[PDB]
Ligand binder design. Structure first.
Ligand SMILES: O=Cc1c[nH]c2ccccc12
Ligand SMILES: O=Cc1c[nH]c2ccccc12
Ligand SMILES: [Mg+2]
Ligand SMILES: [Mg+2]
Lengths: 123, 125
């Protein structure tokens, strides 16, 4: 009974947090220090017309026409832990159309790891 | 196997913990409202940016914090949303210390674990 209780409440908590992330009205992605996409919400995928399998594990410069690989390296490297910055990006959708966004980017520590949390909003 | 079960529970726990941290660490403020404008949940960013403890915010109405909307303005705003509708609009939060913060709110009406809720992401402008 204690086991099943713990499991059931853990599911309920997780489910609510998952809905809050996936349904956020803004696009959300998480990067490692290499610019690799570690996580993305469904809002990010839907706005760009990609399946999450076409986004996770890929590099963020593949999606932002305003930044190449070096540009992204330079951007990420300058952040202090807990620093936030806002800047313009230009995402390329799966169909080749584009989306002008303002990205609000945070360097933070996630599960012991150096990560970046990006919230993108259509301009 | 008990050992296999424990590994499954651990994976579920880590996932929940990860999603928790994404919510709390969001660089933008997050609040969840019911259809009456009552604040049901807030992330740490919301509390920190406005200078309030969570206990000073939960259960209050959003018009108590946004200087650009009275109770009637909030009621009218929320009642116009269809389920899954999103809108962006300007607000002006009043911090605990009386300073103000101009924001653009991106607001969503959606079904959250069976409940009629609004999810608001506020960006400092
Ligand atoms: O993380 C999302 C993102 C979109 N454009 C850039 C550019 C540089 C770093 C991160 C990002
Ligand atoms: O939910 C946050 C928020 C801030 N200003 C307003 C105004 C009307 C509805 C919701 C909100
Ligand atoms: Mg995912
Ligand atoms: Mg009015």
């Amino acid at each position: 009974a204690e086991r099943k209780r713990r499991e059931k409440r853990l599911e309920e908590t997780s489910s609510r947090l998952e809905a809050l992330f996936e349904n956020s009205p803004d696009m959300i992605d998480v990067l490692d220090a290499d610019g690799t996409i570690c996580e993305v919400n469904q809002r990010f995928c839907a706005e760009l017309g990609y399946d999450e399998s076409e986004v996770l594990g890929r590099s963020i410069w593949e999606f932002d026409l305003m930044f190449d690989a070096e540009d992204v390296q330079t951007q990420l490297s300058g952040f202090s832990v807990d620093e936030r910055r806002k800047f313009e990006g230009l995402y390329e959708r799966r169909d080749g159309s584009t989306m002008s966004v303002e990205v609000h980017l945070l360097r933070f520590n996630l599960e012991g790891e150096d990560r970046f949390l990006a919230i993108s909003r259509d301009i």
